[PDB]
Each structure stands twice: as structure tokens, then as C-alpha cells.
Design a protein around this ligand. Structure first.
Ligand SMILES: *OP(=O)(O)OCC(C)(C)[C@@H](O)C(=O)NCCC(=O)NCCSC(=O)CC(C)=O
Lengths: 49, 163
């Protein structure tokens, strides 16, 4: 694993880029889920569907 | 494990229980639909419509017939497939209560992997999940799997299976 991180650093291949991006999209999702839950509360299941 | 199609007696129970917004144990089979509703013909007619949609046909006097005698009358012509009402209610449960990313097929997968319950008994667990619908959408994946676990144990208790 220490030889892998040395080979990454040489090639300039950020290993965690994919996990960083995933955590931004997952915080965006949790913001939109909060906005839809608020509209489903102020209008109701029957109305929104 | 052993694959069983959901009994009409459980489907009927869950549909009544969900419409009245009460737990399965709070609804006794002995009582008639007309007794349970409590003089509100609107809700009575909403239950009758949902059972008529789900099972296709109804008996001649479904109002005065007790729930165990309706469940036995439906089992004579019931196959084991959910139908047009159960399928839609489960889709509305999953969409409205599971976290953004968790679909029905992920629930079906989780039940087939974690518990090993096949499609026939997945449908049963999902019906027990419908009967005990939570208040607000489950925040994370881990408490959504913990809910599916609590519904598997409830399903296993009522049907009489060991997990
Ligand atoms: O359960 P049930 O006893 O069979 O139903 C009882 C009643 C009729 C009371 C129930 O369905 C109900 O509450 N209905 C709403 C009141 C009502 O009948 N409103 C009529 C809406 S249409 C209309 O009013 C046409 C018009 C004359 O202009």
C-alpha cells in the first residue's frame, strides 16, 4: 500500500478524487430531498401525486 | 429458504390496517369492516373499493362478513401475486420513506442477501413494512436496513419462520 501511494504520487493520480466528488453529490441529494420533503409537507401526498 | 406466496389473510389484514391507520394487532379478525370503521360509510366504501381492486371480485355482503371469512372467500380464487393496489402502496412507501438512492429493488436485494428471503416472502416483509409505516423519511441507509430487519423479524413472528 506504501508502494502504491508512491506510484500514485509519481503518476499524479489522485486516488480519493472519486470519493470526494461522491460526498459533494450526496450532500446535494440530501439538500434536494429536504426541499421535496418540505413541499410534500405543505401540500400533502394527494396533491403532489 | 422455502418460498411461499403471501396469504390473502395477511394482504387483507395489511390493506384494512393501512387504510384505518392502525397496527395489525389493533385490528382483530373477528370484527366486521362495518364495526371497525365506526359508522363512517365513506372509509368503509374506500376499503371495499381497495379490496375489490386487489382481489378483482368481492362476496355479496362484504360489510357484515368478518375479516377471517373474507380472507377464506378470497383464498379460493387468490393466486399469490400482490396485484394493482399492493404494488402501488409499496412504491409510495419506498419512494416517500427510503433515502434518495434506495429503490424497491435494493430492498428486495437486501432481503435476498442479508436474510435470504425469496421474492414470495420479500412481498410479505414489504406488506409488514407498509402496516408499520414510519412518520418521517429514514435519514440514512443504515437505519433503513435496521427498519427492514425489524420488519423481517415481525414477518417471521406472524407467519411462524426462524431467521
Ligand atoms: O358512508 P355513507 O353513509 O354511505 O355516506 C354518507 C354521506 C352522504 C353523508 C357521505 O358520502 C358524505 O359525507 N358526502 C358528502 C356530502 C354530500 O353528499 N355532498 C354532495 C356533493 S355533490 C352536490 O352537492 C351536488 C349538488 C346538489 O349541487
Amino acid at each position: 500500500r506504501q508502494q502504491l501511494q508512491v506510484l500514485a504520487r509519481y503518476l499524479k493520480m489522485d486516488l480519493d478524487n472519486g470519493e470526494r466528488k461522491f460526498l459533494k453529490e450526496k450532500d446535494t441529494v440530501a439538500e434536494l430531498q429536504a426541499q421535496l420533503d418540505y413541499l410534500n409537507a405543505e401540500l400533502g401526498e394527494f396533491f403532489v401525486n | 429458504i422455502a418460498d411461499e406466496p403471501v396469504k390473502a389473510s395477511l394482504l387483507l389484514h395489511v390493506l384494512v390496517a393501512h387504510k384505518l391507520k392502525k397496527s395489525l394487532d389493533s385490528i382483530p379478525m373477528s370484527k366486521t369492516i362495518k364495526d371497525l370503521v365506526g359508522g363512517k360509510s365513506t372509509v368503509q366504501n374506500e376499503i371495499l373499493g381497495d379490496l375489490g381492486k386487489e382481489f378483482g371480485t368481492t362476496p355479496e355482503k362484504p360489510e357484515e362478513t368478518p375479516l377471517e371469512e373474507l380472507a377464506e372467500t378470497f383464498q379460493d380464487t387468490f393466486s399469490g401475486a400482490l396485484g394493482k393496489q399492493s404494488s402501488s402502496l409499496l412504491s409510495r412507501l419506498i419512494s416517500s420513506k427510503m433515502p434518495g438512492g434506495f429503490t424497491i429493488t435494493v430492498a428486495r436485494k437486501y432481503l435476498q442477501t442479508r436474510w435470504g428471503l425469496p421474492s414470495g416472502r420479500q412481498d410479505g416483509v414489504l406488506l409488514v413494512a407498509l402496516s408499520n409505516e414510519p412518520a418521517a423519511r429514514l435519514g440514512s441507509e443504515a437505519d433503513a436496513k435496521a427498519f427492514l430487519d425489524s420488519m423481517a423479524q415481525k414477518y417471521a413472528s406472524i407467519v411462524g419462520v426462524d431467521l
